[PDB]
Design a protein around this ligand. Sequence first.
Ligand code: JD3
Ligand code: PO3
Ligand code: FE
Ligand code: FE
Lengths: 115, 118
Amino acid sequence: AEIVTALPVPLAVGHHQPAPFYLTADMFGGLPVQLAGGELSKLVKPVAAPHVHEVDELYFLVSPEPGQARIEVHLDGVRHELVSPAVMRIPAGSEHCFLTLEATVGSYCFGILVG
Amino acid sequence: DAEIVTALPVPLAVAGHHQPAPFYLTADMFGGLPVQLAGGELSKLVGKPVAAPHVHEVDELYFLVSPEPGQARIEVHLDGVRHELVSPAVMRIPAGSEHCFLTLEATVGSYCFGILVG
Ligand SMILES: C[C@H](c1c[nH]c2ccccc12)[C@H](N)C(=O)O
Ligand SMILES: O=[P-]([O-])[O-]
Ligand SMILES: [Fe+3]
Ligand SMILES: [Fe+3]
């Protein structure tokens, strides 16, 4: 049985700290996605830095009950306010970041890099 | 301009599942995705399996996560063998393998996501 428990894996990605990855491209002989992120309640953090990926990134915002988490996604000079649950596509090459406005314990934003 | 999906989750029928499963990523989104992602918060599912044992023809990953490590625990049945996963954990279910999970323990904010890998 293939079980990975040494998680998250910190990987450096404009981002101050290594991002915490729960799926990496090399797991299980190869995955078509990578998945990073974490709980938002301790992330509610005055600044966020813009950055670009060479692949598409999907933001996946979720909370135990709908509406309990809220983020601002900055995408190429446009501010977008999203309420959980939400999924937003960041096209490869686009400068982007997000800020957590509100989040209950158990709210997550995952960044999913699509190969 | 920006592609945003908020009509979520998308209920989709999955083999063996009593009710439609809540999907947050589907294969047709954004012109095509190599994965589908379904699942949700486990705090009300302790003791209550969402599905009978079932088989997919694609690989499925269980992604178990909680705000603090250890706050969520599920039992995965994999071709008649029980495996206990403690958050955070990722488990690969090879295509063709009979499987299901039972929630053993979950705080508010514990999730199990099933990721179908094309
Ligand atoms: C991986 C980055 C991320 C998304 N959600 C997160 C939650 C906590 C810590 C990092 C993240 C992503 N590339 C971004 O654009 O921020
Ligand atoms: O019900 P989901 O974990 O596939
Ligand atoms: Fe990013
Ligand atoms: Fe399954």
